[PDB]
From a paper:
Here, we report a series of cryo-electron microscopy structures of a eukaryotic homolog of human ABCB7, CtAtm1, determined at average resolutions ranging from 2.8 to 3.2 Å, complemented by functional characterization and molecular docking in silico. We propose that CtAtm1 accepts delivery from glutathione-complexed iron-sulfur clusters. As anticipated, the architecture of CtAtm1 harbors the classical ABC-fold, packing into a homodimer with six transmembrane segments (TM1–TM6) in each monomer.
How then do [2Fe-2S](GS)4 clusters associate with Atm1 proteins for transport? Interestingly, the 3.2 Å map obtained from the above-mentioned E603Q sample in the presence of the cluster provided a distinct structure, CtAtm1inw-opn-occl (RMSD to CtAtm1inw-opn 1.83 Å). As such, the conformation is reminiscent of cargo-bound ScAtm1, AtAtm3 and NaAtm1 (PDB-IDs 4MYH3,277N5929 and 4MRS3, RMSD 2.6, 2.0, and 2.0 Å, respectively). These coincide with certain of the residues in the mutations (R285A/Q351A and R289A/R402A/Q351A) that display decreased cluster binding and lower iron content, further supportive of the notion that they partake in cluster cargo binding. However, the inner gate is substantially reconfigured in the shift from the inward-facing open states to the CtAtm1inw-opn-occl conformation, reorienting the N395 and F396 pairs, first pointing toward and away from the cavity, respectively, and then vice versa. Moreover, molecular docking of [2Fe-2S](GS)4 guided by the cryo-EM density suggests that binding of the entire cluster is possible at this location in the CtAtm1inw-opn-occl conformation. Next, the cargo is recruited to conserved motifs of the binding pocket, coupled to initiation of occlusion and perhaps nucleotide binding, as observed in the partially occluded CtAtm1inw-occl structure. Our data are inconclusive regarding the nature of the bound cargo because only parts of the cluster are detected, although flexibility may partly explain this observation.
Numbering used by the authors:
A (entry chain B), B (entry chain A): 95 to 676
The structure:
Amino acid sequence: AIIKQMSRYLWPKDSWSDKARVLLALSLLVGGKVLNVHVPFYFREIIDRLNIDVAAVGGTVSAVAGAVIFAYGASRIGAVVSQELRNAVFSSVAQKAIRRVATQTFGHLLNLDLSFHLSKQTGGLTRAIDRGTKGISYLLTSMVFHIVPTALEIGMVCGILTYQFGWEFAAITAATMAAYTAFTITTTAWRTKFRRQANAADNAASTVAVDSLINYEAVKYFNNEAYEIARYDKALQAYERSSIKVATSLAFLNSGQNIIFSSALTLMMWLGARGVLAGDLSVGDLVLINQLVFQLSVPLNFLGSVYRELRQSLLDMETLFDLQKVNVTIREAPNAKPLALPKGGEIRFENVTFGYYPDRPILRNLSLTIPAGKKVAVVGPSGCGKSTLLRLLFRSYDPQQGKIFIDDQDIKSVTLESLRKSIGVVPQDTPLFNDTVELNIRYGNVNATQEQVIAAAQKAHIHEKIISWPHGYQTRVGERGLMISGGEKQRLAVSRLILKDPPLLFFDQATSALDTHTEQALMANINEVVKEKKRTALFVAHRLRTIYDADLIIVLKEGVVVEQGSHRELMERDGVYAELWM
Amino acid sequence: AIIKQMSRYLWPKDSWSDKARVLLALSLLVGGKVLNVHVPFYFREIIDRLNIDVAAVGGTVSAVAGAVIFAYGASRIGAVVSQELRNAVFSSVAQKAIRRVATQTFGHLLNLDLSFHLSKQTGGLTRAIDRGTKGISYLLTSMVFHIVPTALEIGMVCGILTYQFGWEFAAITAATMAAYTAFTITTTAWRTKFRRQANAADNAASTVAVDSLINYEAVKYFNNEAYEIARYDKALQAYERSSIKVATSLAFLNSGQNIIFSSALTLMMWLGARGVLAGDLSVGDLVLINQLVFQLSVPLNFLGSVYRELRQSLLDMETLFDLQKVNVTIREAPNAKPLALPKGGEIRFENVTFGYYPDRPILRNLSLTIPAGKKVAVVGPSGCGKSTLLRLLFRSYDPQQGKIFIDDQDIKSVTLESLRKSIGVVPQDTPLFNDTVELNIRYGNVNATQEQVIAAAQKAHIHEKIISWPHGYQTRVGERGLMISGGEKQRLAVSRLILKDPPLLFFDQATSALDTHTEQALMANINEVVKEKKRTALFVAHRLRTIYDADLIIVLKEGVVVEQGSHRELMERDGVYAELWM
Ligand SMILES: N[C@@H](CCC(=O)N[C@@H](CS)C(=O)NCC(=O)O)C(=O)O
Ligand SMILES: N[C@@H](CCC(=O)N[C@@H](CS)C(=O)NCC(=O)O)C(=O)O
């Protein structure tokens, strides 16, 4: 638990305005605690300057004690304005560190690999980033607001009560802080289980209500309304049990804490009374002792809540620092070359064996050649493993056995960014960003003006359907935009492809939908935009009645390439429409 | 804003243990504030009993001031234990009121009508119940913890400072509380906009991350990782702007508040000094005045956060009290009769005209008769409005024109609960409760033992497939259970129907799925369980090649019944398989 504190003490520095305002935060911390401890001393002086017999000098308050009254006021005001200014100044440092850490972690995540991003749910990762960065924010914020200043003030109070009254009073206030902290830590560790129980069996009741209201037709059809009401009562009853235990334990915590300070303040009042009756102290030293220890009691009023959230931050920060050290599985070879990509695009597979979970090979000892400018298609049965082809050449994965060469160069030796620039993809299903259609089309090339977007809408016939949209192509689209049809989604994908202008083109199960006439329209569309555009293109389909009129055909059975040639040579195998029995 | 306070002051009462512990809460409130204000008076006595010249009696602390030292300790301890005990005691009252209000609102919601439950999203309604009841909890909790006790203590402090020192000191502390409350209310109203901005542009960044990580294949295929990182930077930058403004405004609030008390305490210190030098007061009366006003400053330290959440509670509580006064659209006639239901089940429609949005009639001037024990089906085109039939007879809706009679009695005159008991439904799609299959089957009859569930699994062949489930029929099923097939969902529905044992049976688009062989199996299954079980049954299908062999057939064109008779008379119209062109 101290290792994380070491790391996150070390990191926030190294800018100039950052270090300037953290110096200002520390300066206001120490000045605030000094002006805080000077309040009881000026209160002692006000008491002890008016404790003269009025048969003495008397006179105006300005002459007797006006300096120390104004100094009491100024010390109180300054001691809280310094607190609020150190908070306002260190919050800038905390927030900037949070922004740069969250950005670095997000970039790391996007640089990780598909096995990782299919292992774990994305909502979990983004909540990990969010809660880990709020945890780091609370660690810096807590260490500068609560943990350090009240420890500094405990030090100064045990020092002044030593310098003026002896080690009796320092011993009492140090034993008080030891007992108060032991008690508050133990009780708030015991109490957070009640807090999380009252949160768990509140989401329980909320989702019981959600389940009953989603299934409203069902609950009404079977006439058991009272059953749902009773189940909601039982869930809410568990909630009220846990909330009552939370409030009761909070009462126990607060009462025990102030029993510890009231025992401390009473014992120091007694020893101050012994000091006064023995003649050592004065009467004002009583309010000095009492107000010093009580002023310690103001920051430590939140010891139970800046330890619960501090430990929760050290739990979430650990998950974020677990994401920050995962891996890079597919890495490029050092000093990778962008070479051999501007050639006549040929992809040759050499004895390639790849499968998900290598104990079950899906693609087995495969070798092929895809020349330049050719509309080649690959066909096969369902689940044979054709879809890995793209995921193998885009170097989303690696070939466990065998090698891949684009125009006489191994993929493991080519620079990753230029490789993935050169490739262009139309996926089987294209998810759409919850944005404007202008930006979904623009996602092919971010630094593209509007006219390129318009042309991309033209070339695959999107412009008519975006004129048909309400706001033009400024329409907000997505899962929360307008519910659209899959054919227009692949039109968006091919518009992305047109804006990329890549050498290599892939259409990986681009026709996988229900009907045929929209499919044959989009097939035609991508044909006149892909052939007569002089780029090498690889279709992928298990529906070969769609791609029977392509240029070069290859077929894969059970992980091996079997037949390679034209349509008529394929005609001895399936390729007839005979699979349309249903 | 005061009307809600009137209502929720009025309601929590009327039980005996409830009123007992609210009496105990109020007793501890007043006792706590009394023991709180006695702390500065015992501190005055400790100061003023040791301010004697030590040339006087002197002696032990026990003789001089030991009673008042122990009384200072006891008053502090008691004044905080009474606070914590009034909180622990009034929390029971608050939670029980919340449970009964949330149950009443939930029962009200389930008693509302389908137009309402299709108008509004269910998540919105359940968050309305949740947040409205947390709002009522915070209103009772806040009014007993913060708003009332600190107003009582302000009253007692302005009363004691009047009784002992004059109206000068009461005027100063009342002007202090007026200025402190005006300032804190104005600043926390100005500051909550920053708080909600920092919450809105944090969900913005979180969903930007969610959108980028869901679309991971897409962002990797177009090589624009830096684009997503930059957009996450802009969202997080807006977050850091708003969080910096939140922390800065909190610093302003806290510093201004303690400027107001420090000006108050200094001005009262000055007038106490004038009183001491004039001989009126004593030196201990200075610590009396200072500690009284400062002890007021402890509860008012949360005035900015028990007003923000109090106003948010009066916003959510209003939405809940808007749900609590909606309507009952379809109500039963007063003294409705359960009569005419145990007859030979015949349903006659008389000149019935119903449509959604009555400016567009969907069903138009319809009259038919459904005798007892007959397997009758109704067919027609897509969207003609056949599905309203069930929703018309179950009295989910009302016939705008025309009347409905089951066995010579109008539906508007029959008791609703016995009506909906007598009806049994197999919906087109049956949602399944996120529970065990044992309870989804049990939902037909809640007070059914296991053997009835087993028999219901037998009669439609569910028992084999629940033996096939991992835990037997104890398997947890649902959206988060095991992903199942639709045919087994309708098997669950008909098992529900068997456990109901109703006279009337409806199968409203029960066959609406993709394939046919599972459909023909489930059609057969429901046939041998429905006919030869001597209950009148109404199938509903727009796929009449499935129901062509039923007993009685009726057909509806464009909202009017056209032909009624056997299968051969229907054969002159469609009913051939000729619609299977695709
Ligand atoms: N002073 C108490 C808690 C003070 C406190 O927690 N105040 C705010 C948060 S700063 C609160 O309401 N927390 C909820 C809780 O602790 O139950 C302690 O020693 O733990
Ligand atoms: N004393 C400050 C607020 C003290 C406070 O509210 N602390 C905690 C626990 S109740 C909190 O909720 N802070 C949230 C905030 O106000 O930003 C005021 O007068 O508003």
